[PDB]
Design a protein around this motif. Sequence first.
Motif, short mmCIF file in Angstrom:
data_model
loop_
_atom_site.label_atom_id
_atom_site.label_comp_id
_atom_site.label_asym_id
_atom_site.label_seq_id
_atom_site.Cartn_x
_atom_site.Cartn_y
_atom_site.Cartn_z
N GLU A 22 0.80 -1.22 0.00
CA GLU A 22 0.00 0.00 0.00
C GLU A 22 0.85 1.28 0.00
O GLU A 22 0.58 2.19 -0.78
N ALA A 23 1.85 1.36 0.87
CA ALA A 23 2.67 2.57 0.99
C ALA A 23 3.46 2.88 -0.27
O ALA A 23 3.76 4.04 -0.57
N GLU A 24 3.83 1.84 -1.01
CA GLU A 24 4.55 2.01 -2.27
C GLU A 24 3.60 2.30 -3.45
O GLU A 24 3.94 3.05 -4.37
N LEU A 25 2.41 1.73 -3.41
CA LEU A 25 1.49 1.81 -4.54
C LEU A 25 0.72 3.12 -4.55
O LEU A 25 0.43 3.69 -5.61
N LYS A 26 0.39 3.63 -3.37
CA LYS A 26 -0.41 4.86 -3.30
C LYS A 26 0.13 6.06 -4.08
O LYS A 26 -0.60 6.70 -4.84
N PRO A 27 1.42 6.41 -3.88
CA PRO A 27 1.93 7.56 -4.63
C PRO A 27 1.93 7.31 -6.13
O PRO A 27 1.74 8.24 -6.91
N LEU A 28 2.14 6.06 -6.52
CA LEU A 28 2.14 5.70 -7.93
C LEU A 28 0.74 5.88 -8.52
O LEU A 28 0.58 6.45 -9.60
N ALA A 29 -0.27 5.38 -7.81
CA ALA A 29 -1.66 5.60 -8.23
C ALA A 29 -1.98 7.09 -8.32
O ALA A 29 -2.65 7.54 -9.24
N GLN A 30 -1.49 7.87 -7.36
CA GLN A 30 -1.74 9.30 -7.35
C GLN A 30 -1.22 9.99 -8.62
O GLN A 30 -1.96 10.70 -9.31
N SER A 31 0.05 9.78 -8.96
CA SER A 31 0.57 10.42 -10.15
C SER A 31 -0.05 9.85 -11.41
O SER A 31 -0.33 10.58 -12.36
N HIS A 32 -0.25 8.54 -11.44
CA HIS A 32 -0.70 7.95 -12.70
C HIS A 32 -2.18 8.18 -12.98
O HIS A 32 -2.58 8.25 -14.14
N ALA A 33 -2.98 8.35 -11.93
CA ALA A 33 -4.40 8.67 -12.09
C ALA A 33 -4.59 10.15 -12.37
O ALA A 33 -5.35 10.52 -13.27
N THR A 34 -3.93 11.00 -11.59
CA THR A 34 -4.25 12.42 -11.61
C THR A 34 -3.33 13.28 -12.47
O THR A 34 -3.72 14.37 -12.90
N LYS A 35 -2.11 12.81 -12.72
CA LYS A 35 -1.17 13.60 -13.51
C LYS A 35 -1.04 13.04 -14.91
O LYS A 35 -1.36 13.71 -15.89
N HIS A 36 -0.57 11.80 -15.01
CA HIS A 36 -0.26 11.22 -16.31
C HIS A 36 -1.50 10.66 -16.99
O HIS A 36 -1.53 10.52 -18.22
N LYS A 37 -2.51 10.32 -16.19
CA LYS A 37 -3.78 9.75 -16.66
C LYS A 37 -3.60 8.47 -17.46
O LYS A 37 -3.89 8.42 -18.66
N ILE A 38 -3.13 7.42 -16.78
CA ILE A 38 -2.81 6.16 -17.44
C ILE A 38 -3.92 5.15 -17.16
O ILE A 38 -4.08 4.69 -16.02
N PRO A 39 -4.68 4.78 -18.19
CA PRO A 39 -5.72 3.78 -17.99
C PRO A 39 -5.14 2.42 -17.65
O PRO A 39 -3.98 2.10 -17.99
N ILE A 40 -5.95 1.60 -16.98
CA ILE A 40 -5.52 0.27 -16.61
C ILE A 40 -5.09 -0.54 -17.84
O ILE A 40 -4.16 -1.36 -17.76
N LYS A 41 -5.74 -0.31 -18.98
CA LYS A 41 -5.38 -1.04 -20.19
C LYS A 41 -3.92 -0.80 -20.55
O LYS A 41 -3.24 -1.70 -21.03
N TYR A 42 -3.40 0.40 -20.28
CA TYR A 42 -1.99 0.65 -20.57
C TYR A 42 -1.07 -0.10 -19.60
O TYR A 42 0.03 -0.53 -19.97
N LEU A 43 -1.52 -0.25 -18.35
CA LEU A 43 -0.79 -1.09 -17.40
C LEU A 43 -0.80 -2.56 -17.84
O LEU A 43 0.15 -3.29 -17.58
N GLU A 44 -1.87 -2.99 -18.51
CA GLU A 44 -1.89 -4.33 -19.09
C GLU A 44 -0.84 -4.44 -20.18
O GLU A 44 -0.10 -5.42 -20.25
#
Length: 153
Positions: free
Chosen positions: A83-105
């Motif tokens: 959780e502590a490692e994933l949260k900041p990553l979700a924050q930037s990727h959701a709100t800044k870079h806007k990376i859909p889950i399909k791109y993570l696939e």
Amino acid sequence: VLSEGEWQLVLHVWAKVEADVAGHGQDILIRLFKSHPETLEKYDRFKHLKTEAEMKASEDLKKHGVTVLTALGAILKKKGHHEAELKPLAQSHATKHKIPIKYLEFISEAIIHVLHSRHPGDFGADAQGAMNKALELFRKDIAAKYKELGYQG
Ligand code: HEM
């Protein structure tokens, strides 16, 4: 959830990645760009790269690949307790870079491709299955964090 045996297979091949993080990172990003060109057109920092040779020569892309794999490796080593490692990553990727889950696939696909290309003797069916589960867990947990932030990726 992954079994302890599954995590060990994941970390066994990851130690191989760590022998040349930069090289693996370059191969992964280049594979991502080749297989899914729409991903590159989203990265303003890199979308000027026109050929594979240009990509390989880019110090900037190589440094970024190390940043990416370092963050992923930190997550994998927590064996789901991330959780502590994933949260900041979700924050930037959701709100800044806007990376859909399909791109993570897509990048998950590239990771598996490169690991198999470089380490077939340490990345057979069972190890591939384990890494697939680990990346599946990563994507599932990041999607839930996306939603908490208001992003439906
Ligand atoms: C394994 C999956 C991924 C990991 C671990 C990862 C990790 C990171 C890290 C650590 C950063 C720098 C800090 C930050 O902004 O959060 C970053 C930046 C970024 N990521 Fe990701 N990323 C992943 C997948 C993706 C994908 C698939 C895309 C695009 C399709 C993407 C696009 C970006 C962009 C555009 C930046 C900013 C690059 C820059 O201009 O400096 N990421 N990523």
